[PDB]
Amino acid sequence: QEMGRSAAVQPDELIFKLLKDGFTQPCYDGQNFFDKEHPVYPNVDGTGSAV
Amino acid sequence: DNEFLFGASTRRAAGYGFWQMAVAVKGDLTLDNLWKGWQLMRSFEGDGGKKLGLKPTHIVVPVGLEKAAEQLLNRELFADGNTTVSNEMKGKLQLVVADYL
Amino acid sequence: FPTLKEWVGKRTIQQMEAHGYSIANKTFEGTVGISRDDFEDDNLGIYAPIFQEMGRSAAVQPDELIFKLLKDGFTQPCYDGQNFFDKEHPVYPNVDGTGSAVNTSNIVEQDSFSGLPFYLLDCSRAVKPLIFQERRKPELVARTRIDDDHVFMDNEFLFGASTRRAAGYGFWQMAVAVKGDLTLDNLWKGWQLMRSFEGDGGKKLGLKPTHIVVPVGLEKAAEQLLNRELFADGNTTVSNEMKGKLQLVVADYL
Amino acid sequence: FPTLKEWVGKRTIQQMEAHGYSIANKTFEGTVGISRDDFEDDNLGIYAPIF
Amino acid sequence: MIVTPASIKALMTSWRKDFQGGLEDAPSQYNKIAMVVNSSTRSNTYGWLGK
Numbered sequence: 001q002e003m004g005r006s007a008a009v010q011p012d013e014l015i016f017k018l019l020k021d022g023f024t025q026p027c028y029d030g031q032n033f034f035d036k037e038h039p040v041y042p043n044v045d046g047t048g049s050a051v
Numbered sequence: 052d053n054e055f056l057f058g059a060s061t062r063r064a065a066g067y068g069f070w071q072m073a074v075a076v077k078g079d080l081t082l083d084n085l086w087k088g089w090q091l092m093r094s095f096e097g098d099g100g101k102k103l104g105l106k107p108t109h110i111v112v113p114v115g116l117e118k119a120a121e122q123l124l125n126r127e128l129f130a131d132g133n134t135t136v137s138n139e140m141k142g143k144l145q146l147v148v149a150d151y152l
Numbered sequence: 153f154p155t156l157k158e159w160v161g162k163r164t165i166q167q168m169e170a171h172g173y174s175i176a177n178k179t180f181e182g183t184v185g186i187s188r189d190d191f192e193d194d195n196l197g198i199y200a201p202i203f204q205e206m207g208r209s210a211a212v213q214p215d216e217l218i219f220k221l222l223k224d225g226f227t228q229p230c231y232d233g234q235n236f237f238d239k240e241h242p243v244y245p246n247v248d249g250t251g252s253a254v255n256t257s258n259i260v261e262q263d264s265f266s267g268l269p270f271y272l273l274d275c276s277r278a279v280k281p282l283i284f285q286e287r288r289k290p291e292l293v294a295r296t297r298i299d300d301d302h303v304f305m306d307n308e309f310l311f312g313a314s315t316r317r318a319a320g321y322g323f324w325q326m327a328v329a330v331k332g333d334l335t336l337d338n339l340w341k342g343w344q345l346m347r348s349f350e351g352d353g354g355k356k357l358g359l360k361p362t363h364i365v366v367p368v369g370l371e372k373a374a375e376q377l378l379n380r381e382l383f384a385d386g387n388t389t390v391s392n393e394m395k396g397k398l399q400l401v402v403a404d405y406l
Numbered sequence: 407f408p409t410l411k412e413w414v415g416k417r418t419i420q421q422m423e424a425h426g427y428s429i430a431n432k433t434f435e436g437t438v439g440i441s442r443d444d445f446e447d448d449n450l451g452i453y454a455p456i457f
Numbered sequence: 458m459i460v461t462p463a464s465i466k467a468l469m470t471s472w473r474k475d476f477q478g479g480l481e482d483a484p485s486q487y488n489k490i491a492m493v494v495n496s497s498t499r500s501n502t503y504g505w506l507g508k
Contacts, residue, residue, distance in 0.1 A: 002168075005482060006153035007059045012152035013155070014065040015487040019111065020151065022075065027067040034075040044099040044507050053433070058163060061156060068492070101508055109490055114347050118340045121393050122385075130388040147490065150356040150483040174470065277481055325480060351480055358483035424461040 071095045072105060080112065080119035082131075085140070111147045120146055154247050155353065167248035169352070173231035175320035177287040182209065183312035188296075191309050203294065206313050210290040215406035217319040218282055222271055222365065223405065225329065226259075230321045237329040247353035256349065258324055260342050262332030268369055269331045272342045272361040272398075281327040288316040325349045325359060334366065334373035336385060339394070365401045374400055 018025070022033040031038055039050030074092045078084045089107055097103050112120050123129065124146055129138050154166040184202070191199055221228070225236035234241055242253035273281045295302060295310040302310055328346045332338040346361055366374045377383070378400055383392050408420040438456075445453055494501065 002153040003057055003059050006155065007061060009152055009482055009485075010061060010063065010156050012483075012485050012487045014063065015491050016149050016151040018065050018067065019073075019490075022067070022073075025067070027070050029070065031070075033067050033070055033073070035070075038070055040096060041098050042100065046098060046507070053435075056165070059153075059156065060159065064496070065491075098507060111490065115344065117347065118344060125393050127391045128382070129390050130385070133388060135389045145489075147486060149486065150358060152356045152483045152485060152487075171476075173476075278478060279476060283475075322476075323480065356483040357480045359480075422459050424459055424465060426462045426465050428464070 071097075071103065074107070080116050080123065082123060082140070085110075085123075107144060109147055110144045111149050114148060114150055117148055120148065155355075167250070169247070169249040171231055173320075175283065175285055175318055177285065177316055177318045180213070180315045180317075181312070182314075183310060185311070186309050188303065188307045188309050202311055203292065206292050206311060210292070210313050210315055212406055213315060213317065214284055214319075215403075217317070218284055219403050219405040221282055221319055221321065222327075225321070225327075228321070230324045232324070234324075236321050236324055236327065238324075241324055243350070244352045245354070247355070249352050257345070258328060260328065260330040260332060260338060260345060262338065265332055267331075267333065268367050269329055270334055270364065270366045270370055270374075272328045272330065272339075272346060273363045273365065274326045274346065274359050274361055276360070276362045277326070279322055279326075281322045282319065283322055284317070284319045286317040290315040325357065328361070334370055334377060336377065336383075336394075339364075339377065361398060363401055364398045365403055368402060368404060371402050374402065 023035075024032060027033045029038060041050055042048040072092075074088045076084050076088045093106055095103055095105055110120075110124075124138075124141065124144065126138055127141065128135050130136070153168065157164075186199065186202070226238070227235060230236045230238075232241065237259050239257045239259055240255045241258055243256045244253050245251040275281065291314055293310075293312050293314075295312075297303060302308060328342050330338050330342045343361055346359055349357060349359055351357055364374070364378070378395065378398060381392055381395060382389055384390075407422070440453060448454060
């Protein structure tokens with residue numbers, strides 16, 4: 001029963017550790033999830049000078 | 052070895068979705084900081100100048116910030132600088148007091 | 153159980169721990185004596201309810217025992233060897249209770265306080281903070297037989313009662329003592345201290361106070377804090393956000 | 407039990423004693439290995455009585 | 458009065474299993490902020506189209 005509970009608890013320890021350390025892990029656009037430089041290109045095709 | 056073994060194993064993974072749908076507030080849990088986060092998240096745009104429709108729905112705080120959350124979101128009439136005023140942000144957000152289980 | 157870790161090479165076998173605690177029973181007595189002639193020579197029925205007084209005298213022990221527990225919770229020990237209310241409860245960083253222990257606090261102390269403390273418990277889970285074990289049900293004996301040795305040799309009736317029971321502590325993580333004034337700040341400090349306890353190994357326990365026990369002399373503050381719909385928080389009228397959350401127990405320490 | 411005396415007057419309540427002793431038990435192991443081939447070609451049956 | 462040794466007096470206890478589950482774990486609340494997707498192979502790939 002104890003090992004079953006330990007296995008069951010894991011999905012929360014995974015997700016809430018993701019928000020917490022979101023300043024260091026990278027996301028899809030390349031930068032960190034929580035970041036102050038996340039590009040927003042002026043063209044739909046993803047080409048211009050990022051803001 | 053004259054031993055009994057108990058073992059468990061799982062195959063899982065956790066990842067990030069869209070960065071545009073989350074905002075981290077590195078400050079105190081005041082009304083001003085909450086509204087700053089709200090407006091900053093509402094100001095996001097997509098590529099090419101498109102205007103996305105986003106607004107916060109959930110607020111996640113550690114167990115050490117429960118006093119400030121309950122004294123700000125669950126009070127019908129609270130204090131706005133030494134005067135009693137109505138609470139305009141009572142049912143807007145859903146509070147998640149996460150123990151980071 | 154140990155927390156799941158990423159599997160790279162071979163499984164690393166770990167360890168767990170077990171705990172133990174013991175509470176010992178004690179015996180009790182009380183007896184009174186009335187002469188046979190005086191007992192049988194009343195018509196007013198004034199000496200009649202001696203048996204009822206016996207029952208009502210032995211039916212009040214559990215409250216006294218339990219509430220005398222909390223009161224002296226700073227001296228008597230708990231299962232980990234420290235006192236129930238202690239500022240040095242060891243919490244280890246490994247599940248098997250092996251590592252550099254960090255001292256966790258169970259008491260909220262206010263500077264230069266000389267008043268009556270109040271307690272915050274969590275009576276919601278399977279195990280309640282306090283235990284009351286009864287060994288033998290109370291027995292009430294009235295020696296009135298004419299061939300009884302005491303009756304035969306002394307012409308005196310004997311009325312006696314005896315009980316065998318004790319009480320003890322449970323989990324120290326489920327009870328917090330606040331040696332301070334009964335104000336909003338101290339109450340919230342105790343709440344957040346109770347909510348921050350965690351087990352060995354980083355295991356996150358979900359604990360939350362459900363009862364607040366105060367002595368008779370603190371009923372004014374308890375009723376002024378937990379029953380006012382609109383109270384004052386820093387020279388301002390604000391809604392009571394802790395109304396209907398805790399349950400008040402004004403114990404006479406019976 | 408206390409020795410029986412002559413009953414003159416009231417009885418005297420004497421005392422007794424009890425003792426204790428405990429023994430812990432250990433585990434012993436012993437093993438021997440024989441190849442599968444040399445054990446599965448026993449026409450004679452020489453290695454059979456190893457039990 | 459029988460003067461029993463200390464070990465015999467220590468063995469005169471009754472075992473109670475009221476403390477069995479220990480302290481229960483925190484509530485699980487990760488479904489409120491996460492989307493659950495089932496994978497069937499070495500990894501998952503997600504792709505969307507720009508505006």
